[PDB]
């Protein structure tokens, strides 16, 4: 029923700095079972990193060096935070948080994972606007006489981390649909990506939104791109 959220699509940090990746659980009762943290190094397999129980003890995988990682779990604000000190290149990987969700009885448990956060480590600080720049594309008149449908297309370019997420929604009734996108393309140390959606005869009158989740959107929040009706 519940699920884990990891808002940070990615966290970019420069060497020696310290990263803090969050996990907010919702719909699942925190106090009882422990919050786990998995690390997926590039090329490697997903592996256990650390975990914090309900009592407060914390176990780390075999080999994890001293004073590198830290975990906590504020139950009031239903969130756990993995802290990575003196970040370095070998820390580049995708970090996942997960926990065991009870179902009905004992002997019926499922391990739920968060979407993951990608830790990106660069050499120098970036000084320029890197937020994805949007571009609206309304269907071609002609198409509306095809399957009497319409196909929207939002183009996002000049964004940096490259780790991006695009999905669509009905303006009012905001429930994810079923669109398609092309591969993210590099364009001189910056990237672009596009997503398109073909709305059926019915929905032509409604309004639609292209929602972009990116580490560097303005204000640090999802970018909501408004697509006129018609």
């Amino acid at each position: 029923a519940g699920h884990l959220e990891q808002p940070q699509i990615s966290s970019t940090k420069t060497l020696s700095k310290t990263a803090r990746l969050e996990c907010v659980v919702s719909g699942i009762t925190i106090s009882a079972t422990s919050v786990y943290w998995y690390r997926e190094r590039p090329g490697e397999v997903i592996q256990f990193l650390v975990s914090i129980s309900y009592d407060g003890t914390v176990r780390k995988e075999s080999g994890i060096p001293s004073g590198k990682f830290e975990v906590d779990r504020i139950p009031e604000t239903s969130t756990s935070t993995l802290t990575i000190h003196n970040v370095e290149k070998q820390d580049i990987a995708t970090y996942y948080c997960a926990l065991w969700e009870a179902q009905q009885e004992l002997g019926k448990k499922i391990k739920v994972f968060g979407p993951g956060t990608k830790l990106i480590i660069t050499d120098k600080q970036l000084d320029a606007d890197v937020s994805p720049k949007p571009t609206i594309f309304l269907p071609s008149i002609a198409e509306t006489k095809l399957q009497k449908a319409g196909t929207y297309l939002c183009l996002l370019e000049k964004f940096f981390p490259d780790v991006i997420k695009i999905h669509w929604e009905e303006k009012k009734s905001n429930t994810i649909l079923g669109s398609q996108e092309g591969n993210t393309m590099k364009t001189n140390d910056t990237y672009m990506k596009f997503s398109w959606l073909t709305v059926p005869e019915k929905s032509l009158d409604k309004e639609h939104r292209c929602i972009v989740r990116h580490e560097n959107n303005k204000n640090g929040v999802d970018q909501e791109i408004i697509f006129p009706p018609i």
């Binding site: 422990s34 786990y36 397999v45 997903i46 592996q47 256990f48 975990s51 176990r59 996942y96 065991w100 019926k108 499922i110 391990k111 739920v112 994972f113 968060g114 979407p115 993951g116 571009t135 609206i136 594309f137 309304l138 269907p139 071609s140 002609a142 198409e143 095809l146 196909t151 297309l153 183009l155 999905h167 994810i176 079923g178 398609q180 996108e181 092309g182 591969n183 393309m185 672009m192 596009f194 398109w196």
Partner: protein
């Protein structure tokens, strides 16, 4: 010590055509561990699919079927009716079952196996071609065509830049495609496609 290894790194599949994913354990006995299957697809990341003995995630029991071949410590997941939504990476993970101490309920993963979905062998289809714009920004939209091989051209005298096109599976189990570019004479730009030895124009629909 204990390790899970997928049968193949990549496993291509065709829509509607049953395919199975396997993953062997090379450490102990598959029985002393509960096997789980997770997957990563566009949109939905690291979703739960199956856990030892009939446990399925919402909407996975209908299309998927997990099972174990204790014979040779194999973990299997059969995809009955592949679709676009099933393209992604699939991961097998195991874990212990009530050890005599303060054991860790941590899972051990295997490297993922990527499955790619392509339409099933069908009869050819001439595509439709439309083009939408927005100041120098022109995008060609090729709808419903088969086979995959196609060439997309945005007719233009003065062109700024052109991006790699995208071929995708359509709801009809065929193909759709989009190609974006930046053009000075964007207002006049049109799209022409070469497919199945034919030539379709954006203007063939105006």
């Amino acid at each position: 010590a204990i390790e899970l290894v997928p049968e193949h790194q990549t496993v291509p599949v065709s829509i509607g055509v049953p395919a199975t994913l396997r993953c062997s354990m090379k450490g102990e006995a598959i029985g002393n561990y509960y096997i789980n299957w997770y997957r990563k697809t566009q949109g939905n990341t690291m979703t739960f699919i199956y856990r030892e003995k009939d446990i399925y995630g919402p909407g996975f029991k209908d299309n998927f079927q997990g099972d174990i071949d204790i014979a040779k410590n194999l973990a299997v997941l059969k995809i009955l009716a592949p679709s676009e939504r099933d393209e992604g990476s699939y991961y097998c993970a195991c874990d212990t079952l009530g050890m005599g101490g303060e054991y860790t309920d941590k899972l051990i993963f295997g490297k993922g196996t990527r499955v790619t979905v392509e339409p099933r062998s069908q009869p050819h289809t001439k595509p439709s071609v439309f083009v939408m714009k927005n100041g120098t920004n022109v995008a060609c939209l090729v709808k419903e065509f088969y086979p995959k091989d196609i060439r997309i051209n945005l007719v233009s005298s003065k062109k700024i830049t052109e991006f790699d096109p995208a071929i995708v599976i359509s709801p009809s189990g065929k193909y759709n495609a989009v190609k974006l570019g930046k053009y000075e004479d964007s207002n006049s730009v049109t799209c022409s496609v070469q497919h199945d030895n034919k030539t379709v124009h954006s203007t063939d629909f105006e």
